[PDB]
Structure formats: C-alpha cells, structure tokens
UniProtKB/Swiss-Prot annotation, chain A:
One of the GO BP terms on file: menaquinone biosynthetic process
Keyword Transferase annotated: yes
Higher taxonomy: Bacteria, Bacillati, Actinomycetota, Actinomycetes, Mycobacteriales
Name of the gene this protein is made from: menD
Record CDD domains: TPP_PYR_MenD, TPP_SHCHC_synthase
Alphabetic keyword roster: Magnesium, Manganese, Menaquinone biosynthesis, Metal-binding, Thiamine pyrophosphate, Transferase
RNA-binding among keywords: no
Function: Catalyzes the thiamine diphosphate-dependent decarboxylation of 2-oxoglutarate and the subsequent addition of the resulting succinic semialdehyde-thiamine pyrophosphate anion to isochorismate to yield 2-succinyl-5-enolpyruvyl-6-hydroxy-3-cyclohexene-1-carboxylate (SEPHCHC).
Protein name: 2-succinyl-5-enolpyruvyl-6-hydroxy-3-cyclohexene-1-carboxylate synthase
GO molecular function, one term: thiamine pyrophosphate binding
GO CC annotation terms, alphabetical: plasma membrane
Superkingdom, natural source: Bacteria
Natural source organism: Mycobacterium tuberculosis (strain ATCC 25618 / H37Rv)
UniProtKB/Swiss-Prot annotation, chain B:
Stored SUPFAM superfamilies: Thiamin diphosphate-binding fold (THDP-binding)
InterPro entries: MenaQ_synth_MenD (IPR004433), THDP-binding (IPR029061), Thiamin_PyroP_enz_TPP-bd_dom (IPR012001)
Protein name as annotated: 2-succinyl-5-enolpyruvyl-6-hydroxy-3-cyclohexene-1-carboxylate synthase
Catalytic activity: isochorismate + 2-oxoglutarate + H(+) = 5-enolpyruvoyl-6-hydroxy-2-succinyl-cyclohex-3-ene-1-carboxylate + CO2
GO cellular component: plasma membrane
Record's cofactor remark: Binds 1 thiamine pyrophosphate per subunit.
Pathway, per record: Quinol/quinone metabolism; 1,4-dihydroxy-2-naphthoate biosynthesis; 1,4-dihydroxy-2-naphthoate from chorismate: step 2/7; Quinol/quinone metabolism; menaquinone biosynthesis
Native species: Mycobacterium tuberculosis (strain ATCC 25618 / H37Rv)
Keyword Ribonucleoprotein: no
Pfam families to which the protein is assigned, alphabetical: TPP_enzyme_N
Swiss-Prot record, chain C:
Protein name as catalogued: 2-succinyl-5-enolpyruvyl-6-hydroxy-3-cyclohexene-1-carboxylate synthase
Record carries keyword Transmembrane: no
Positions in coiled-coil regions: none
GO BP terms, alphabetized: menaquinone biosynthetic process
GO CC aspect terms: plasma membrane
The species this protein was found in: Mycobacterium tuberculosis (strain ATCC 25618 / H37Rv)
Subunit structure: Homodimer.
Cofactor(s) in the UniProt record: Mg(2+); Mn(2+); thiamine diphosphate
C-alpha cells in the first residue's frame, strides 16, 4: 500500500541524484522513514538524524551546496515547518535544491479543535518552486504499473523543480506523501529524463568603454570577460586573473559595469551600481536579476563583446589594485591588536587549491574579500541568499560532508575550513551536537574569530563615537561565552590559539571536527578601517 | 505635477515602451490617475484605449487582444471587487500562457484594516495564479527624489512586463501590478513627465530569451505526433502523421484525424504542447506500452498519466518513418474523414457539426478563427479543418465559458491593428455555442466611444442547450443583440458561406441536438 | 460511506438553520449533491441553480442577508473559486454567513502538470473565518459525532456564533439508514447566545452627533440624539440629522455606530482631531478615519443629557437640508437618479425590503431623507461593488418571502444604477426549475453612464473634454430588449408614475426603467448646497 509507494519514491529520489537526507525524530512517523532506513543500511542513500529541526534544515543546505546535489529533509512534527522556515528562505534566495518532505493524513479532520499534522505558516506560498502532493496509495494490484509510473514521474517533477532542470532556477520544493518493488527505468536512469537545459540571452557590450566586472553570489563563468578588472565576492567563481580590490573601486571612475550574479557586499558597490551616469549590465545564470535603485540598464546571461579595454584603464586599475591590498597589509602590520580582519587574512594565506571555504555573514565574509583572497581553485560557500548569522555551523558540517563524499566517489579527503564570528558560532552552537550514529566530517575545521560581540557594528553609523555610551548593549551585544567549555560539552576537539598558530595548526590534520578559537578585538576595528582608508 | 499624476504617467509611458498597444479600462475613482494617463496616450495614438463596464468580461477582452497579435495587454480597474472580478481571466491567462497585466489601483496600504470604503486585501489576491504580484508603492511628494523614483517605477514596470511576457522565463502569464494611490487623484490645474530611456528604449532592456532542451528521438520507430494548445513548430517532425488540435500550429502536410488514432497502433508518440481536447488522445497516452516524448516551448509539460520518457523543446532526429507506416496512417486518415463527410451529408438535419463544417469550408488563408472552448472546438476538429495559414484562437487554458464573446472581439481588434500597421482588413469569424453566447452576451457591449472590430463575424450555432444538470433556455439571441446594439441576422447553414463573403455582426444558425447521438454513432460505425 | 457522510452533513446544516443552497453545473459533481437533491425534493432545503458562478455567489449573499440565515454555495468547477471571489470578499467585509462547499480528492495528484480540482487563489487565506475539511469516510456512531460536530463548527464560525464576527467559511468534504442527530431537531453541539460586552462612558451633555453605518447596532439609550444614519443602519431613535446639514453644525463629539462609508462630511468630521469619536460596534472590528477614533466599545453608559439648544440647532439644520433637497428637485426640470430615489422612497410602506445598489442610489436615498423605520434595507457595503447587485436583490427577495411564507408576500424593491444593472444582467436568467421571487421589483435609474463621477473632482468642467469616455462610460444599452431576452417583465416609465406603478403588483420579477439625466447632476447638487 503506502509501503510500496514509499519504496518507489525513495528509489526514484536516489535515481534523481539525492545522496543525503536529513531527519529529526517527531511525534508522527517521518514520510518514507522506513524506506529511507532500508536505503541507508544498503548504502544507496545517507541519512542524517538531528534533534534540532532548525539546524537540520541548515544541515541540508550544506549537504546541497557542498557538491550541488538535491537534498531531502523529512518533516516529522508540528514545529517542523516553523523550524525549517529560515533554511527554506535561504534555499529560495540562494537557489539551493532543497526537497522538504511532508506526510498528510487525509482521513483526519483538518482545521478544527486540534493541532495540525502540518502547522502551516505563510512562507510556503512564497518560497517554494513547487508544492507537489502524491495522493493516497490505493489497494489496486491490477493498476500497480499505472501507479508506479504516476509516482515516479511525479518524483521526477519534484526533482526537476528542485534542481531547476527546466527553469535554470533551483530552489526549495514541498513534496507531500499522504498517509492512511515495482522497477524504475533500466540501467538506473530516471523515469522522466530532462536533459541539460541551456537558457541563453545575449547582450552586446563594448569593452572599449572603461569597464569593471562586479560578480556576486550565483555568478556565472565568462571567458570573454576574463581580462577585465573584476571585483569578485568570495562566493563568485572567477573567470579571469585581473582582480580589483573592493577598496580600490571608490577611487576609480568606471564608465560601464558588468554585474554578474547577485552582489551583496561593499557600500561602494551599491553606490556604483546605483549611479545613473553609469550603464550597468546584469548577467545572471537564472531568470531573476537584481538592481540597485533601478539602475540596471539590461539583463542577459552572456556578453557578446566588441572592442578592447584601453591599456591605460587596465594599468590604472591594476595599479589601484596593488595600491589597495598594500594599504590593507601595511596597516594590519602596524595595528597592535588582533582583529577579525587579521584572522581573515591568516586563513586566506593558509588555504590551498582543493580546499572548501565556508564563510559566515557579518565581518568574516567581507574581511576575507578585503584581505585579497584568491578563490581560484577553492570552493567558497556562504549563505548569501538572506545573509543570516543562523545555521552556519551546520551549513559547514553539511558542506564538508557532501564535499568529502564527492571526493570519495573518485588521497585523504579535502579540507573544509570555516571562518565565522562569535555570535554566528553561538547562534548555531547546537549544530555541533552529532550522535555517534550519524555521519561526521573527516576534515572539517571551524575557525571562530571571537571578538565577544558583533564587530561589523563598529563600522556602521551606530559605531560612531557619539553613540559609544549606548551602542554596546544593543549593537555590540557581548556574551562572555566560554567557547572552549561549550565545545567540551559537545565532545568536539577545540583549542584557543593565536593568529600565528593558524597556518601551522590548520596544516596539521586533527580530529574530523575541530574548532579553532582566535580571540579578536573590536575595540579598535573602527580605528583600523579609518587608518586603511587614510593610507589609500 | 502631483505625485499620483506623475507616477501614473511614468508607468503608462514605460508600459508603452514595453510593447503594450492595447489597454482595457474599467471605470472607477481610485484609478483616475491611470485613466487620465491612458486617455492621453490614446489621444496621441500611442495606444488604443478600450473602455468596458464589467471587469470580468473585460479581462477576457484583454486576453483576446493578447492572443490576436501576441503582445502584452493591460487591464486597469479600480480597487475592491473590481480586482476580484479579474479572477477568472487570470486563471485562464495562467494556463494559456497569456501576458495579461492586471493593473489595479488601490487605497494606500496604510488604510487596510481601518475599515476604509472599498478597501480589501488586494496584494496577493491572485495567489499562485500570477507570474508575479508587484506593488509599485505609494508615490512620495518629494521633488528632489523625482529622478530616483522615476528609475524605480520604470524598473518595476519592466519587471512586470518581463514576468508577463516570459522575457526571461519563457513562460508568459498574468501579472498583478498593484498601485496604491492617494489624493489628489486628478491632475492639478502646472501645464513634463520624467523621461525614460532615449529613442523609446525600455528602462531595463531584456532581449527575448532562448530556452533550449534537445532530445534524442528515433523516427524509424512507428511514430504519431499529437500537438495540443501552445505547441511549437518542428520542421524535422513535418513528415510524421500528426493529430493536431485546432489551436496547435501545423508543422507539416501529413494530418491524422483524431477518430483515426484509436484504430492505429503507434509504437511511440511525440507530444507537442499541452493536449487538452480529444478523449481518445488521452486513452492512448495513459498506456505504458507506448513511450511518450514531450516537446514544449516553455518550462511546463503535461502529466502524461505517466510514461513520459523525456521532455524537451526540440527533437534531434535519427532515421525516418517507415513508408508502410505512413501509408497506413494516411489511409486511415482518409477513411476517418471520409466517414465523417459521408455521414454528415446523409444526416437529414443541420447539427452543430454541420455548422462547424460549413464554417471551416468558408475560411481562407489569412482568416482568424475564434472557437468556443466546448463543442465548437471539438466539432471543428471532427470536420477536419486544415488550420494551415489560419490563426485559430480558443481559451483552452481552462476551457471555461466566461468571456468568450469578449475574447473574440479582443482577438479581432488586435489582429486588425497588426494588419493596419502595414488593402482591406482580414476576417475574424467566431463559432460560439448558444449557451456560451448567452453567458457572455454582455461581452458584446461596446460603448459608442470605443473601438468596434472592423471585420468580425460571430457565428452562433443555436441548438438551445449544450442535480445541477436540471437547468438544461429559449433566450432570444436577436433580442440580446439589440440590447447591446449589434447587427444580427438569423440565417441557414447554406447561406453561411456566401454570407461570410459579404463591421461586427452576429449570425445565428438554428441547429438541432436531437440527432447528434444518432449522427455520432453513425460516424463510429462507418469507421 | 461517503453517501452516508453527505446525508449526515446535509442534515446537520438543516438543523443549523441552512434553508437555501446555491449550485452551478461544473466539470465534476457538486459536494453533497445527491443528499442535497433529496433534501430539496423533501422540502427540507431549497436549491438554486445558476450557470454564472459569479452571480450565483451574490445570489447566496442575497439569500443570507434577506433573513439572516447561513447560506451554502457548492463549488463544482475550476473557475468556481475565481468567480466566487467577489462575493466571498463582500461576505467577509459585510459579515455575511456564507459557507463555501468544496470536495477535494485525496487519491489524485495535486500541484502537478494538470488542471486542479480547485484552482486556488490567494484570497481564501485572507477572507474566510475558517477552513474545515471533513476527511474521507463499523465506527459509524463515532464518525456521525465527528461529522456533526465538525459541521456545527463550520456553522458556528460562519454565523459568528462564538466570535460575534459572522463571515465566509470554506468547508471541504473529500470523496473517492442514516445515523440520527440529536433528538427533537436540536443541533449536535449547541452554542447558546453569546454576548461580547464593552461599555464606554460617554457624557451626553457635550454636543453630540451620532453617525451609524453598515452593521450598526441598536442603542435605546442614544435615541434622542441627532443621528446621521446610513440607509442600511437600523435606527434606534426618532431624531434624524440629514447628512447635508452636518457641515452646518459644530459637534463637539461623535458616537460612531458600525462601519460608515457614505458622505464626505461624515469622513471630514470622523477625522477631525478636535472631535472625540467613540466607536460602538457589534463585532470585534472597529473603523477609524485618519486614526481619530478615541475609544471603542459595544454600548454606551451615558451621563447627562443633550443641551436643549443643541437639539434645536440640529433640528433646524435638518429641516433646512430637507427643504433644500425637496425644493431644488422641484425647480429642476430633467429627471435624475436623485429624483428617482425620492419617488422610490415615498412609495415604500412598512414591511418592504429595500435593496440599494452602490454609486449614487444608496447615496441619493439618504439625501432624499428616507425614514428606514419598518423597512429592511440591504446594500453590499462590504466592498461597495457594482457587481452582483441583481442576484443580491433576487436572493434577498427569495429569503425574505420564505421567511414570511413560514408565518401564515412582502415587497422587495430594488434601486440600482444602469451600470450596476448591466454588470449583473446575467442574474436575470432563471430556469423554470429554479425558485423565482413573487414580489420583487427592480427600479433601474438609467442615465447611460456613471452619474456619481459628475459629483466628484473628475466631474469638474475642466475635464469636460476627457471625462465622458473614461468616467461617464455611456453604453446605449437597450434595457427593454435585455429583459425581454431573459423573459423578464419590464416597463419604461417617467418618475411621475413610478410611484403608482410600484403600488400595483406585477409579475413575480419585474424591471422598472426610468430614464435619467446626469449632465445636470453637478448643477443640481450645487443648487442644493446653495439652498442649504
Ligand atoms: C539571524 C540573524 N540575526 C541577526 C542578524 C543581524 N546581524 C548581522 S551581522 C551581526 C553580527 C554578527 O556577529 P559575529 O558573528 O560576532 O560577527 P563579527 O562580530 O565578526 O562581525 C548581526 C547580529 C543577522 N544577519 N541574522
Ligand atoms: C465591481 C465594481 N467596479 C467598478 C466600481 C467603480 N464604480 C463605482 S460607482 C460606478 C458607477 C456606477 O454606475 P451606475 O450603476 O449607473 O450608478 P449612477 O452613479 O449612474 O447612479 C463605478 C463604475 C465599483 N464600485 N465596483
Ligand atoms: O542571480 C541570482 O542568483 C539571484 C538570486 C536571487 O534570489 C534574486 C532575488 C531577487 C532578485 C534577483 C535575484 C538574483 O539575480
Ligand atoms: O506547454 C504548454 O503551453 C503548457 C501550458 C500550461 O499552462 C500547462 C499547465 C499544466 C501542465 C502542462 C502545461 C503545458 O504543457
Ligand atoms: O462593524 C463592522 O461591521 C465592521 C465590518 C468590517 O468589515 C470592518 C473591517 C475593517 C475595520 C472595521 C470593520 C467594522 O467595524
Ligand atoms: Mg564578532
Ligand atoms: Mg447611472
């Protein structure tokens, strides 16, 4: 009955490329729970069990962005929708193939004097690419074949919407399997096959006009833009090797901007993208496109270029790039205290091709860009879809698990190194709790630049000295957490170290999961950035 | 100029730059800034304004102006139930992939919850039916912010346009564009609108996109093509026998009658678009014995009742159909349509099928045909209409009866406008059942100030009919036509063809429902 | 088993007071269709079938406000949700107990590449008081209890039985000798009279005016006060204040009853920060204009009494406003909607049901000074649409006549504009199988366009060149031929004889058309103000 339907869906889901599913024990039995257990023992799919439904959703995001696979999470309780909300919104904005699995009871009253099987909020209506319900399995062995095809093709429709197999717009899907082995295609092929879909929108750009590339989250690779000065966010794949340090951009006067993906960092980027005297061309990989103050002049997916940049423009930007990273390095050297920017510069020098970098929001993701990281050869992950400081520990854990599993399918597994701030760490500290029955990454290291509060607020307008009396409680928000004791409580190896130890410590493989705490200072963060501006 | 006027003129100016050539408008006080702006563009000849009274049928008018020429069409109305009345047209525009922009005026959102007159939860009313629901935001009284506001208003408008036309998604559909407006709502007694791009370019240019998904298919396997609503043109599929719905564009010269399909044994079928029509088409699709390849123009693809091997946008073909297979389908096609034409002539009295055959015999290349989504689209398909060189429209999105008359009027008007931008205008002939005509009879209503189609003939085949089924009317079609001042002459099926050679008129042809069961059974037995 | 379930649910709806259910032919069978057919055959319930789903929704509105009973309408097609939307919005805002019946299918695909059983829009989540689904059908005595309690739940939410906020409810009954209910016809779960009490201390010595709007309650302790009552407000006293007199007075505080929506002077005062406004409503919601309402309640505990001079000043402006309207209507040659409204107002006798369309009609009746005492006045003031007014009158006539018939046939007179009439013209077609009112007269004041815009800013003569096409919207519809096409009795008369025509009974349904002028509306109203 349901059991055959259950095994059919899981089989099709595996054929569709799902390799990881995330579960939490709930009052109701999970949708497909027994079928997933069977598949997990046989080695066809990998289960991850958590108690915290919120960190479990972010765990599923990590398992998806770690290697690009669609990931399932099976809701189990009345609080699951509420707890999965944040990760679903992130999956929508960051275009992450996340399949949320539900199980409705159609023989039960709905909307009356009882808690509902699925406590429904409003976000499913606005966040998901599809909400598909399979419909009740029926006792009909005469029609066994007809239901097999109906179940499997619908599962392919779920996967198609999840991975953007026809829309070029991956994102979350709500897959419902209500509650009261037929074979798939031969050679393991999916039931309904959707080929690679190319979505193409050419755009004429004249490269002789002084041009800068600004690539952000979700940017595509563009070989014909490789030589242009490029301000690339850390999660943006780089097409060339002519980088433009973000602090150098406000000291230049570009006449034309090619904008790749969705930029979210640096105030001078916002100022330039909003400049009515500067044409801005949005090149994206999906149907969506962003704008700053309504200044995007055209949208497309690839450039058709004529002309070539004037060598004086390239030399002027190249000299501005060298000037910018020099001021950063020089005044970090002349700065007596350790700041998060110091920490980010140390992590940047320690990484090597093949690593995976997972960056928290707030200062870490900006600090790494300011330090001049060369992301070539490195996979950079960061939840830029909504830029939350929640769920980052489990994002790194899932991203490391997925990435290490992909390396396995082909030497020791590649390094996954994470740089997050202290609030970010305390937010998702329950992500460290992993039972001995669950998969744990072999080469994950989490670097926590701990300046005992939110350092990025020392740089905004509320960090101005005229607010010094009142800004500590409501923007600084110190906590005095014993990071080492918290890691001890969760049985994860942890050490507090100084900046010079980071490179050596990271090079020496430790336990599968380790937390490297570096005590940083934000008292002097504003003065440090003011000095970096003054050196420019 | 006050904010509401400035904002409404900027919005209408950008919509014209986006290709809007026709706007349907419904009266109201809250939408006065749009109406004022729209009439000026009408008087300057940038658009054609169409005023209607009934929002619901006005939406299907807008649909017709969209499918007749292929352009985005706005419908603008006041706040409250005026917006709810666009519901039915939005559902049809959703499934039919029609670029219908619902341009609603609204009270300031700050009044929602105060009990203000005619103030409801507008934003989001249409839910998932629309491609997007976009609120422009209340216009600030800020003269120094004007240029900035111009950039954001225009950019929002092009987002509305892009979602509605599928400029980047390849999935055209309806879009809700809500505009909160505040007093003053009429232009001030100040005698320049913030400018858009030079040379009439759109604020955010987005070139039409290419969405490609190639599919390996082997034509040596005995194949039949089934092409439904929204199907595309496939030259490498032109030689194969094709069962094509009336609104599906023909790719070749090898037709297959729908009655002939269930008497043949195809080994694979290529499905084009979304087959909505034939009952035998669906019975063969719901068969795991025969593989199905779905070729669509956009991201959507139909539930095949299972057993769809693959979906794509185009075929890459190896091999060629068996000559024997071609001869067999071609024989059965002749046999099926010969059985229809012979039983028709043998039937003593004129039926709905006879009227449909007479219409098809009278069409000629260049004509536009609008069919009611019930029996007319089936009857014409049974008569074997060669839709090549003909534009065939029908609201096959949900196949409702709402707005069928207005859709025909909208399609004629938009079709004629396209011809006008290049001798005498082409003909648009509509075939509507009486119950459908009775239902949307108020869709005939065109105020004396508004455009009437130049060459539109609505053919009503009246058979006085098709626990709720107990209502199945004897409603005078002529009297209805006088009530909305439309010339109507009742005729017979033999005068139809000659008559159609002769502005907007209705030709009622009295038909019989008594003998179709006998007629249809006679066709089944002749196969 | 679903047959038993439907019979149980239909039976519980009868016991819950449902007397009328509206149906539409659609792609699949309606929910409860057979059990509803048996109830209609046996006379326990009255079915009304229409083709137009939108007019069928408003028919249910009429059948609900005509006598206060909960009314069901059963969706049967894909476009049903979309076509029912306008009525459901009105039912939410006007607090009308509308039960929308759905029959979802749990054994079928949902959300896939196919047309859906229900094409869902976004409004159900914003408008309805509840969404209850029964769940698919040896345990028959327990299932009977679950089904009947759930059905009472639906009824309670729709009638505001525990919330005091009646409104629309979505009731889903899934599908792939009948168990009795409580004895003596009692409902399964009894919810007794609920009283939501919220007293407000108001000093009546302060110069006070009362403004009452839609849904206003009756306050015997406010009878003596001057009252600017909207037509659909039940009057508690005998001291009216004409709305045009309001700007000639200086009230010091205002008691606002229900939800007012008419007259700019009412809005201007309700927003005056120097005027305390107390909102007395019958339900949990309360209105505000510009956030000026100082307090809310359900009733007033009063201290003091109005000043004798205040009563006299209000009464004098009241007479002056009545004199201004009556006199200027006499010195105006052409006939307008305001003349037609006055003639209707004088033809009404106690026991009548007056149904007023939006636009000028419901305003003109207020300006004509109609005493609503003894009259049952209906108007779709929830959203003030001009849609669905014909079927609203028809359903209200049917429910009102059915109330009287069960007592041992009062008149329903409708006054609507021409645009309003053309909007819901499809409501005139009723099959011979379907209930038809016996004493419904629809007066159509036809000035070939929307006369209300002649009275607004867009009616200023500076827009005379452009106003007619986009605000007037003339249509030249032959109203006579329209009613003829639907086999509806209709005559076209002058206003001189509309009075007498309404005095002599006619066919069960009849349309009286009075040709009107709107090119002189702005001058007429300007003269009324100049005569004030
Ligand atoms: C879920 C969530 N809550 C609150 C915020 C607001 N916020 C943005 S950055 C930030 C400071 C983060 O502190 P930390 O992790 O210590 O980073 P650093 O101090 O290194 O900047 C906060 C609270 C957010 N982005 N996401
Ligand atoms: C469904 C709907 N659409 C549009 C409007 C806007 N509107 C308000 S009054 C009016 C004119 C009504 O015309 P008519 O029925 O002739 O009344 P008159 O003012 O001429 O008496 C319009 C179009 C509305 N209230 N409801
Ligand atoms: O390019 C992307 O990946 C991307 C992702 C998004 O979530 C967006 C949301 C709004 C607007 C533009 C977006 C966008 O361009
Ligand atoms: O190809 C099309 O045009 C088309 C359009 C649609 O609205 C569909 C809706 C559901 C399922 C398939 C669909 C489809 O194939
Ligand atoms: O009293 C009523 O009948 C009533 C009805 C409504 O629909 C309201 C909506 C918003 C705010 C107040 C409201 C109100 O006071
Ligand atoms: Mg910090
Ligand atoms: Mg009028």
């Amino acid at each position: 009955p349901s059991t055959t339907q259950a095994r059919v869906v899981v089989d099709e889901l595996i054929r569709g490329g799902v390799r990881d599913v995330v579960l939490c024990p709930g009052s109701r039995n999970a949708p497909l729970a027994f079928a997933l257990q069977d598949a997990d023992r046989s080695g066809r799919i990998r289960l991850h069990v958590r108690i915290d439904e919120r960190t479990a959703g972010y765990l599923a995001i990590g398992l998806a962005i770690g290697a690009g696979a669609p990931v399932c999470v099976a809701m189990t309780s009345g609080t699951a929708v509420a707890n999965l909300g944040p990760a679903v919104v992130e999956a929508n904005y960051a275009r992450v193939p996340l399949i949320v699995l539900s199980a409705n009871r159609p023989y039960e009253l709905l909307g009356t004097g009882a808690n509902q099987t699925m406590e429904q909020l409003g976000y499913f209506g606005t966040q998901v690419r599809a909400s598909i319900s399979l419909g009740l399995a029926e006792d009909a062995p005469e029609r066994t074949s007809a239901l097999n095809a109906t179940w499997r093709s619908a599962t392919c429709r779920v996967l198609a919407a999840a991975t953007g197999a026809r829309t070029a717009n991956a994102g979350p899907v709500h897959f419902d399997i209500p509650l009261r082995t037929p074979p798939g295609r031969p050679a393991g092929k999916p039931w309904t096959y959707t080929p690679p879909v190319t979505f193409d929108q050419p755009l004429d750009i004249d490269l002789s006009v002084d041009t800068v590339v600004i690539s952000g989250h979700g940017a595509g690779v563009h070989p014909n833009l490789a030589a242009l000065p490029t301000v690339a966010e850390p999660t943006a794949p780089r097409s060339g090797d002519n980088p433009l340090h973000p602090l150098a951009l406000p000291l230049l006067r570009p006449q034309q901007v090619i904008m790749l993906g969705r930029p979210t960092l640096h105030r001078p980027v916002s100022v330039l993208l909003a400049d009515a005297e500067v044409p801005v061309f949005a090149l994206t990989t999906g149907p969506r496109w962003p704008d700053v103050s309504g200044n995007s002049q055209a949208t497309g997916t690839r450039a058709v270029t004529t002309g070539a940049p004037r060598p004086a423009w390239l030399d002027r930007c190249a000299a501005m790039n060298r000037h910018a990273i020099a001021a950063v390095r020089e005044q970090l050297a002349a700065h007596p205290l350790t700041t998060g920017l110091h920490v980010a510069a140390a992590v940047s020098h320690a990484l090597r091709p093949g690593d995976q970098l997972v960056l928290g929001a707030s200062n870490p993701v900006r600090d790494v860009a300011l330090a001049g990281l060369d992301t070539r050869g490195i996979r950079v992950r960061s939840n830029r879809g909504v830029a939350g400081i929640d769920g980052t520990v489990s994002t790194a854990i899932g991203a490391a698990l997925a990435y290490e599993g992909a390396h396995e399918r082909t030497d020791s597994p590649p390094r996954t190194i994470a740089l997050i701030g202290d609030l970010t760490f305390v937010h998702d500290s329950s992500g460290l709790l992993i039972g001995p029955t669950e998969p744990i990454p072999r080469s994950l290291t989490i670097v926590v630049s701990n300046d005992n509060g939110g350092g990025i607020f020392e740089l905004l307008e509320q960090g101005d000295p005229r607010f010094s009396d009142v800004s500590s409680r409501i923007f600084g928000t110190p906590h005095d957490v014993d990071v080492g004791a918290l890691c001890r409580a969760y049985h994860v190896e942890s050490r507090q170290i100084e900046v010079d130890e980071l490179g050596p410590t990271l090079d020496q493989p430790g336990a599968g999961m380790r937390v490297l705490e570096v005590k940083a200072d934000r008292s002097s963060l504003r003065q440090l950035h003011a000095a970096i501006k003054a050196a420019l």
